[PDB]
Design a protein around this ligand. Structure first.
Ligand SMILES: [Mg+2]
Ligand SMILES: [Zn+2]
Ligand SMILES: [Zn+2]
Lengths: 107, 99, 422, 99, 60, 149, 248, 731, 125
């Protein structure tokens, strides 16, 4: 930890004297011998995440259900709408249909 | 272009060779497809897709006069030296209607 | 939430008003105190308060390094000079605490001593923060510099008598420019020299454990009865608020607060100029019930006329003699005549036709429209109707005012028939 | 472009010119659609702006009703007369002999 | 030219400038005044004179 | 982020279900629906936005960030993650948009505009570099593409 | 297509994380052939793609793990005889993450580019206890350099590749079988291929410089072609492969 | 022209030269007078702005001043001596157009509906756009290029501006300034500023465990060196001081005056500066964890400079230059000329200030060497395309960036622009997002005296910061109170303080434009009183019911009260962005809940002037509204009632303009219906002949023949016949 | 250590114990009074102008209200910044122009803040 001298208030460092390890300041003859054990834990953060991802139930966090696509007309789908282009007057669509492991990706 | 006030440039070549190269290489009929993926860019557009869609609908049934008028509406220019070739009607016994 | 209990009294004492100081150590917690530390002296100045405490610290304690003490003592002072030494012995024995001034004025701060049922307040003459000063290191650096100078001079075993006679280097006492003079005055060295010009005063220390502490602690109290009505501290809350917050020093520009500060006549004039249509009761409510009704009536009779029991501002009030029509540029006299004709038509009949007024007054459409909008509203299939209904109460209450306004309107009608040839 | 505000303005203007009023297009408010629809149905016109229209060219009625109404069109300073440009040989710059 | 302008000639032209500026004269007046001054300063008898002569010449 | 994704999923469910309901309730010969079917102009998404319900306003692929302290606008409570308080537009263009929804839509429009403005310059510079680098190649007669050297 | 590209977002490629630069900035980083690119992605195939235990094992093998991320507490204890830093390894978290790290591997991790700590300074007392006793180096360093150790002792690498910053387990849910692969956000393909359990024959990367330096110029050309085609397809627009082949 | 110019004259009232003492030039009082023209020979004459437009001259008033000086030690006083010409803004206090009726406007050939507020120089109409900049004297915590989260503070006083930064590049805090050779640790500066104990420094930084863990490396690096006293630290700084014990004095002067100019030291007492830098280090430490990085686009930290402040700075610079020139002329003339005593009146150049003002207004480039300010594009030519064009260009605001980089941050639409700036109104093009327009209902505050604010804060229990150590700054319940970036002190239970301050402001004892805000994340109570801040009126809501009732509105409609009465009776109050950040505003009455403090007056006030022309804008798309505003800024129509006598280089007029049938309330407010810029035509939405494929439209021949769309274009051709130096003229 | 309140503070100082305590309260700049025959002006009236004796009362209402009646107005007393460092209240009496006495009166632990009740002053008039 951070310790300060009661005399002048400067930071105390740990050195070795003639009898035992002691805290001392660099601007005053104040010292303090260590009698019992002193500890300073920090408890660093541990890795809690298992880093497992990609589940089909978690992936199907989308609105698209029971629609009709021009590729395989399967019910389960995955739609995305984009409006980030002023030159294109209409909007932009991205539809994916992987109900029977098709994996389509078009505009 | 979108016909919203955009200005376009028009150049006139001053050489027969340049004119011929422009007409051949940069011809409109010879550049109907883009070299990126071969998809045709010069095609139907708004007020042409909707018109052709409403025309080819199954509800459309035109008599002789309207069908002849719509056919003759294109008989201008180089199409003035060709026969009309009026197709036979689909329904004829109740009423003679051209789809 | 009533004061059920704890009705403590507050007393005031002026015994130690000029002798009470507050010493706080920002680096020393309240747990450890300086009661057991033997003090030696305290330097202080009456003006520009800056106290320097000089205390003594033990050495035989295990929390002191005698070797480092000898080292720092040999560093700060000489070998055996001892003429001006920061420490008497060869060890660091004396400690210096320097005070910093928190604020200039401490009148708003007071110390409170609490006894059973009473709280005594005592003003503070000054507040200073005591911090461990590092001044022996500066003298140590000066000693090191002079030792380096001595070593430079002693490069040779025997130094010949140097012919370094001090040539007269008396510099011109040049007249300093006012900017440079202000820079010198605002310099830190000048302020430090001015502070040092004041002589120091030495004081002894008396700890809390001493009998003198408990002897002088009773001076914070004051001899007085339990219940005494203070002669001062009797100002109203409004006066207190004025004390703690001293002041710095279209036609509707003046607000209501600025209006109420104006005389009654000016208030009535401005209100009739702004609204142009208002009853007497509304005027009495706006001006306030503390104003007599006769004064308000006499004031409104000068700038307003009676129309169907209501009060309408006069034409000359809205249009001064130097003004003109903002739409046509005609003189204000014609506007006043037209407005008087409109008001006469309204007094004769509640319904007024705009076309008839435009034909008689020979004015444009916009002027007649502005004249009618000020006192009328458009009713379909009926023309223009007065905005306020017939107020018969004021008519029944003041018959003499009604008769005077009736004869004034008769004179105005005579003038209008003379002018417009009605 | 989803300019329903233009249709609402057209309907409000039609209702206003029918009943002799000035409808308000105030943001987050103004005259509602029900009021202008009632104003249209009161004067004998359609409550949706679409009216029976006959084609001027062929003289036959159109299959779909046309959306008529007064719209406040404003002309812009961009004119074809000021933007039309043509360059002959003409002058050149002193530094670089270019137009 | 304009480099063989003596310190006195520079002072005279600056005097003309400030004199026509304090009167709030248009720049055409300043141009005409400095032109007249440069034309009158061509004489040998005028260039060799005191400051009073140059100042009254600026005034004239 | 899990809560954000769940709320976005619920709002998208509302949007798509309202769009499906509007497309089912609309009758034929409808000019917007007709132009959307033939693909001449517009789509079903624009129809659903202008008739049934406007979608979630997405800025940089996320909800409206908190411009003020712990909230997007002072009209909503602090630390409030409600849909209408983060960019959702319940009303459509026909019924009229609330001031908050209109402000969010204007934010999205300005974001798209500045994105396109930066994209134009970036792609112009990239195209200039690519053409200046690739202008030397040409197809020879021996079916081998060779450089100028 | 650069003008046609909208520079969209939310295109996490199905993992809902690991924001990658795609679009015109991606094409620019590709054509510039920079040695260091933004957000490098490395795809590694597994020999046992059906077992998640082996996937997490090879992940811990390839992912860099710091000392502070696995130790439960690090305390500077100043005993009356000597002062030293005691690090307690969390064996429970170690066996949870399936890391092949013990007290000996931790001790071997120290004394490597850490102010030249001698092997006698670091010692092991228990099963998961590491005691570090530094000495003064005389180069303006005393015993009160212990604090300096507290600044960088938890930030030492004990297992994994230093260049690897983050590795995740991606899963493919194909109807035939759900297979497991490694997505590494690092810039070291050779180390990933050299690790045990990783099928290096089917390992790709996004950084063209690493592919060029590791697997030849033709592998770099193929990587450039595939990456440009993928970036173009992500925006829904298609380009003939001959153009990107000529560019590469 | 009424207050600030007198203060500027008082600041430089006395000017004297070093040589020949007892000589001085004392200014007494400066007047601007009425606008006049110097066409007549030494005679002034009242001139209308339209005459200035026609004659291609400037519309200015002669700035004169009364003075007293010493010619030959005999004091001579001058009561009326013109010194310059200040261009008079139209419709100002001294302008001839104010206080006039529309008939008098017709007599002067000026449109009564003209907004005014623009200068007329050399016949052209120039408008000074509202400048937008970052707030001064504020700590900004931001990430660097390498990701390091550092801090910056641009301390700007009336004399000098200095931006000092602090970084954590190597786990320790280094302070960087332009007057230092190399960045030095913060602990050395702490030791140099009086506080030498490390314990006090740590207490001032913070008492949290993570705070000490972060500040540890700095203490270690400081203990590595032999710096332990104030003298050693000052010597080290002086060694690090760049050229412009002497080094110690220079270091102390730089620490006291140059570094943190906004933080004042009474007499070399750096206690306030120490607390300020400690709070800055604490904020940096707190930001080094959770990424709570402040954003630059937050308009609560923006300041708007109008034409007044710019003209004040320009006049101050010009007056200082004139005084320096006069002192130089005196030093050159008095000591060697003659016994003829020199006087300043013979050298009072009157064209200096006039030419300076004319050039700064016309060219638009402002170069202030005294402040090192080099700005361009300050003034712009007023667009006379239509009434809407000028009315919208008059309320424009430019950005400080000025297209230096496509950041896309400030170009975006921030939520802080609510009620202050129009969201949709923005020029389409490269300037999208950098040029904005004010809202319909907005106001810009001015500077206050700041005296009663300090008095009320001291009387409200705010303890002095010098009385306690920095440890109290680490307490969770102790909240810091600031004042324009200066640490005002500490307080406990800030809710009572804020409530009392707001109640006192509503009562009238405190100016209604003084803003107060509270940040619970940083636990800081900001009290803003400087000018340039944007405020918006809001109806006060107390206990789920607004203070404004139907009776108050009836009295307002009848004329019993005005808006000032609503302000005085604690009914409607102005809220700043920082203040509304903590308040709860309700859009409508039905939205009012228990936790509501204010009510929105009108929602459609969110839009600007141009966006108000859009009928039903909430039913359209935002790019559509932007394009509509852009085209309305270029719409053709009538300009004013004096458009016939007006002679401009290019004018577009409509033959038969008609007011719209669907008009917004903003249109009635701006009186656009009196000057329409379009025509109502019977449009039929349909496809015809295929000549309207993409955005095109088909026009009727008979309609165009009967006058629909007929337009008029007026161009100007100017020629000058000037006389040259020689006695010859153009004929 | 929980944050105490002035009412409970005085209650435990008087009911729980009887030992005296030294407090340090901060009074406003101007007191609601007039300097008695101090040669004036509406200037500041501090404790240096008032005389000895009873000058005000300390009331403790319900719900934790702590007020100070200094005449017609009533201020409120709240807890100040909880100082933890050493604060020694001493008396420095300069009896002689050459030698003086410093008397340590006691220690300061708690700090009070007295503030005007502006709400009551506003609703009064
Ligand atoms: Mg276009
Ligand atoms: Zn010490
Ligand atoms: Zn399918």
């Amino acid at each position: 930890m951070l310790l300060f001298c009661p005399g002048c208030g400067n930071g105390l460092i740990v050195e070795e004297g003639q009898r035992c390890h002691r805290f001392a300041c660099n601007t005053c003859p104040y010292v303090h011998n260590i009698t019992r054990k002193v500890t300073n834990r920090k408890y660093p953060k541990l890795k809690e995440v298992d880093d497992v991802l990609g589940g089909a139930a978690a992936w199907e966090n989308v609105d698209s259900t029971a629609e009709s696509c021009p590729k395989c007309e399967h019910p389960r789908a995955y739609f995305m709408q984009l409006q980030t282009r002023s030159a294109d007057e209409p909007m932009t669509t991205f539809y994916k249909c992987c109900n029977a492991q098709c994996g389509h990706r078009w505009r | 272009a979108d016909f919203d006030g955009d200005e376009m440039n028009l150049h006139l070549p001053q050489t027969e060779e340049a004119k011929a190269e422009a007409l051949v290489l940069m011809g409109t009929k010879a550049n109907l497809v883009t070299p990126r993926n071969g998809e045709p860019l010069i095609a139907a557009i708004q007020d042409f897709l909707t018109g052709a869609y409403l025309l080819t609908l199954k509800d459309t049934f035109f008599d002789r006069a309207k069908a002849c008028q719509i056919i003759a509406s294109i008989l201008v220019g180089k199409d003035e030296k060709i026969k009309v070739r009026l197709p036979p009607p689909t329904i004829l016994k109740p009423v003679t209607l051209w789809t | 939430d009533d004061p059920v209990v704890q009705e403590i009294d507050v007393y005031l004492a002026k015994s130690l008003a000029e002798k009470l100081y507050l010493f706080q150590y920002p680096v020393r917690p309240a747990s450890m105190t300086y009661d057991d530390i033997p003090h030696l002296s305290a330097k202080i100045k009456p003006k520009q308060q800056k106290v320097e405490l000089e205390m003594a610290i033990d050495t035989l304690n295990p929390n002191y390094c005698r070797s480092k003490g000898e080292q720092i003592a040999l560093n700060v002072d000489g070998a055996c000079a001892d003429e001006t030494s920061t420490y008497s012995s060869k060890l660091m024995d004396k400690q210096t605490f320097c005070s910093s001034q928190t604020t200039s004025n401490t009148s708003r701060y007071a110390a409170a001593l609490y006894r059973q049922g009473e709280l005594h307040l005592t003003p503070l003459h000054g507040i200073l923060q005591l911090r461990p000063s590092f001044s022996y290191l500066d003298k140590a650096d000066a000693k090191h510099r002079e030792r380096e100078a001595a070593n430079e001079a002693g490069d040779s075993s025997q130094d010949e008598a140097e012919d370094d006679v001090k040539q007269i280097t008396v510099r011109f006492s040049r007249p300093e420019s006012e900017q440079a003079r202000q820079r010198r005055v605002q310099s830190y060295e000048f302020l430090q020299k001015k502070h040092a010009e004041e002589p120091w005063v030495h004081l002894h220390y008396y700890g809390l454990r001493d009998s003198r502490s408990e002897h002088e602690r009773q001076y914070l109290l004051c001899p007085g009865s339990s219940g005494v009505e203070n002669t001062e501290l009797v100002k109203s809350p409004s006066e207190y608020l004025m004390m703690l917050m001293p002041p710095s020093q279209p036609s509707n520009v003046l607000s209501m607060a600025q209006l109420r500060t104006l005389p009654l006549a000016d208030q009535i004039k401005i209100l009739m100029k702004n609204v142009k249509v208002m009853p007497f009761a509304n005027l009495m409510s706006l001006l306030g019930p503390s104003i007599d009704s006769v004064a308000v009536l006499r004031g409104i009779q000068k700038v307003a006329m009676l129309v169907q029991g209501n009060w309408v501002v006069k034409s000359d009030i809205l249009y001064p003699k130097d003004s003109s029509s903002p739409h046509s540029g005609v003189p204000a006299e014609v506007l006043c005549r037209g407005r008087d004709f409109v008001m006469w038509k309204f007094t004769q009949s509640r319904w007024v036709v705009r076309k008839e007024v435009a034909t008689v007054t020979k004015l444009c459409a916009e002027d007649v429209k502005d004249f009618l909008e000020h006192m009328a509203v458009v009713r379909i299939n009926k023309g223009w109707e007065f905005i306020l209904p017939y107020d018969g109460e004021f008519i029944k209450k003041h018959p003499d005012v009604v008769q005077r306004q009736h004869m004034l309107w008769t004179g105005i009608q005579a003038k209008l028939e003379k002018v417009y040839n009605l | 472009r989803m300019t329903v505000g233009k249709l609402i303005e057209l309907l409000a203007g039609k209702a206003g010119v029918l009943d002799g009023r000035f409808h308000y297009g105030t943001a987050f408010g103004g005259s509602k659609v029900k009021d202008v629809c009632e104003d249209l149905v009161r004067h004998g016109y359609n409550y949706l702006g679409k009216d029976y229209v006959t084609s001027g060219i062929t003289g036959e009625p159109l299959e779909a009703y046309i959306y008529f109404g007064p719209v406040y069109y404003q002309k812009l300073k961009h004119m074809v007369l000021d933007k039309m440009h043509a360059r002959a040989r003409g002058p050149r710059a002193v530094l670089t002999r270019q137009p | 030219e304009n480099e063989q302008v003596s310190r006195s000639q520079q002072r005279g032209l600056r005097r003309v400038r400030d004199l026509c500026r304090v009167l709030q004269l248009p720049p055409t007046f300043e141009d005409t005044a400095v032109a007249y001054y440069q034309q009158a300063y061509r004489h040998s008898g005028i260039r060799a004179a005191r400051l009073q002569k140059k100042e009254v010449l600026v005034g004239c | 982020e899990t809560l954000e994704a769940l709320i976005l999923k619920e709002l998208s469910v509302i949007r798509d279900h309202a769009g499906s309901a509007c497309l089912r309730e609309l009758d034929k010969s409808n000019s917007p629906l007709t132009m959307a079917l033939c693909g001449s102009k517009g789509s079903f998404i624009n129809i659903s936005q202008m008739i049934a319900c406007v979608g979630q306003q997405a800025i940089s692929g996320s909800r409206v960030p908190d411009g003020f302290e712990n909230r997007s606008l002072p009209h909503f409570e602090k630390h409030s993650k409600l849909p209408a308080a983060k960019g959702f537009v319940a009303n459509s263009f026909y019924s009229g948009l609330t001031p908050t929804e209109f402000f969010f839509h204007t934010m999205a429009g300005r974001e798209g505009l500045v994105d396109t403005a930066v994209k134009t310059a970036e792609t112009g510079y990239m195209q200039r570099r690519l053409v200046k680098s690739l202008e030397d190649l040409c197809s020879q007669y021996d079916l081998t593409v060779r450089s100028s050297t | 297509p650069g003008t046609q590209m909208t520079l969209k977002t939310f295109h996490f490629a199905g993992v809902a994380s690991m924001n990658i630069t795609l679009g015109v900035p991606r094409i620019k980083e590709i054509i510039n052939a920079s040695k260091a690119i933004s957000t490098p992605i490395i795809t590694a195939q597994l020999d046992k793609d059906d077992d998640a235990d082996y996937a997490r094992l090879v992940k811990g093998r390839i992912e860099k793990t710091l000392l502070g991320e696995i130790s439960e507490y690090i305390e500077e204890v100043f005993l009356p005889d000597d002062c030293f830093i005691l690090v307690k390894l969390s064996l429970e978290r170690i066996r949870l993450l399936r890391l092949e790290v013990n007290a000996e591997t931790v001790r071997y991790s120290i004394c490597t580019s850490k102010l030249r700590v001698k092997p006698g300074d670091v010692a092991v007392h228990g099963e998961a206890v590491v005691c570090v006793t530094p000495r003064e180096n005389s180069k303006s360093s005393m015993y009160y350099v212990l604090q300096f150790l507290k600044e960088d002792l938890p930030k030492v690498v004990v297992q994994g590749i230093p260049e690897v910053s983050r590795a995740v387990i991606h899963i493919d849910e194909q109807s035939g079988k759900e297979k497991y692969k490694l997505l590494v956000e690092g810039d070291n393909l050779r180390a990933v291929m050299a690790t045990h359990g990783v099928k290096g024959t089917r390992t790709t990367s996004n950084n063209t410089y690493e592919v060029e330096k590791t697997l030849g110029i033709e592998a770099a050309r193929t990587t450039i072609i595939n990456e440009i085609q993928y970036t173009m397809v992500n925006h829904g627009m298609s380009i003939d492969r001959r153009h990107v082949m000529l560019l590469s | 022209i009424n207050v600030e110019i007198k203060k500027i004259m008082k600041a430089n009232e006395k000017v004297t030269s070093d040589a020949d003492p007892m000589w001085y030039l004392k200014y007494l009082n400066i007047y601007v007078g009425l606008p006049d023209v110097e066409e007549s020979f030494n005679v002034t004459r009242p001139v209308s702005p339209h005459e200035c437009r026609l004659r291609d001259m400037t519309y200015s008033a002669p700035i004169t001043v009364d003075i007293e000086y010493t010619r030959g030690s005999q004091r001579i006083i001058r009561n009326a001596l013109p010194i310059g010409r200040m261009p008079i803004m139209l419709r100002s206090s001294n302008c001839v157009l104010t206080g006039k009726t529309p008939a008098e406007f017709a007599k002067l050939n000026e449109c009564p509906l003209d907004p005014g507020g623009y200068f007329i120089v050399k016949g052209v109409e120039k408008v000074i756009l509202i400048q937008e900049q970052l707030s001064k004297n504020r700590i900004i915590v931001e990430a660097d290029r390498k990701g390091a989260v550092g801090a910056s503070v641009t301390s700007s006083t009336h004399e000098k501006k200095s931006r000092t930064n602090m970084a954590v590049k190597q786990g320790r805090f280094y302070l960087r300034h332009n007057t230092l050779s190399e960045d030095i640790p913060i602990v050395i500066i702490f030791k140099a500023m009086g506080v030498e104990s490390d314990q006090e420094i740590v207490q001032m930084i913070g008492t949290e465990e993570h705070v000490m863990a972060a500040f540890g490396p700095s203490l270690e690096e400081c203990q590595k060196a032999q710096i332990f006293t104030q003298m050693q630290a000052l010597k080290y700084i002086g060694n690090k001081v760049r050229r412009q014990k002497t080094k110690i004095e220079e270091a102390r002067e730089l620490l006291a005056s140059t570094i943190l100019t906004h933080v004042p030291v009474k007499e070399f007492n750096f206690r306030a500066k120490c607390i300020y830098t400690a709070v800055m280090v604490r904020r940096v430490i707190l930001a080094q964890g959770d990424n709570k990085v402040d954003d630059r686009d937050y308009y609560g930290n923006k300041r708007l400079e109008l034409a007044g402040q710019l003209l004040s700075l320009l006049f101050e610079d010009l007056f200082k230059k004139f005084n320096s020139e006069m002192k130089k002329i005196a030093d050159q003339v008095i000591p060697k000329q003659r016994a003829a005593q020199f006087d300043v009146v013979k050298h009072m150049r009157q064209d200096q200030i006039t030419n300076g003002m004319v050039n700064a207004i016309s060219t638009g480039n402002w170069s202030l060497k005294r402040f090192k300010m080099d700005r361009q594009g300050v003034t712009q030519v007023l667009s006379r395309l239509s009434y809407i064009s000028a009315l919208g260009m008059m309320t424009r605001i430019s950005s400080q960036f000025e297209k230096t980089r496509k950041v896309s941050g400030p170009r975006s639409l921030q939520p802080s622009q609510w009620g202050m700036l129009c969201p949709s109104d923005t020029p389409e093009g490269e300037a999208c997002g950098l040029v904005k327009n004010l809202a319909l209902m907005t106001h810009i505050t001015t500077d206050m005296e700041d005296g009663p604010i300090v008095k009320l804060a001291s009387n409200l229990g705010v303890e002095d910061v010098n009385l306690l150590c920095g440890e109290e700054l680490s307490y969770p319940n102790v909240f810091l109170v600031f004042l324009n970036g200066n640490i005002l002190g500490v307080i406990r239970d800030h809710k009572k303080l804020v409530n009392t301050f707001r109640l006192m402001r509503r009562a009238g004892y405190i100016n209604e434009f003084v803003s107060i805000s509270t940040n619970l994340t940083d636990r800081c109570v900001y009290i803003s009183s400087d000018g340039g801040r944007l405020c918006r009126p809001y109806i006060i809501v107390k206990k789920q019911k607004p203070a404004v009732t139907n009776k108050h509105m009836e009295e307002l409609a009848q004329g019993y009260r005005n808006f000032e009465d609503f302000l005085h009776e604690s009914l409607v109050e102005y809220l700043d962005v920082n203040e509304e950040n903590d308040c709860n505003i309700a859009l409508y009455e039905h939205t009012i809940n228990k936790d509501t403090t204010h009510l929105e007056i009108e929602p459609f006030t969110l839009l600007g002037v141009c966006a108000g022309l859009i009928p039903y804008p909430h039913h359209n798309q935002s790019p559509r509204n932007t394009y509509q505003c852009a085209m309305g800024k270029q719409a053709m129509g009538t300009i004013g009632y004096n458009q016939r006598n007006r002679i401009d280089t290019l004018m577009y007029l409509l033959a038969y303009p008609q007011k719209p049938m669907v008009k917004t309330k903003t249109i009635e407010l701006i009186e656009f219906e009196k000057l329409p810029a379009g025509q109502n035509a019977t449009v039929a939405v349909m496809s015809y002949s295929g000549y309207d494929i993409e955005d095109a439209l088909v026009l009727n021949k008979a309609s165009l023949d009967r006058g629909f769309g007929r337009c008029l274009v007026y161009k100007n051709a100017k020629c000058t016949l000037k006389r040259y130096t020689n006695q010859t003229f153009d004929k | 250590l929980p944050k105490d309140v002035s009412v409970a503070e005085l209650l435990r100082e008087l009911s729980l114990t009887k030992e005296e305590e030294l407090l340090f309260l901060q009074l406003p700049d101007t007191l609601p009074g007039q300097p008695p025959t101090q040669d004036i002006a509406e200037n500041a009236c501090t404790l240096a102008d008032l005389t000895e004796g009873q000058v005000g009362k300390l009331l403790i209402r319900k719900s934790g209200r702590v007020q100070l009646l200094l005449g017609k107005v009533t201020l409120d007393v709240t807890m100040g910044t909880a100082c933890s460092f050493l604060q020694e209240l001493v008396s420095v009496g300069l009896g002689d122009s050459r030698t003086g006495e410093m008397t340590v009166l006691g220690h300061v632990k708690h700090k009070l803040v007295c503030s005007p009740d502006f709400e009551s002053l506003l609703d009064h008039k």
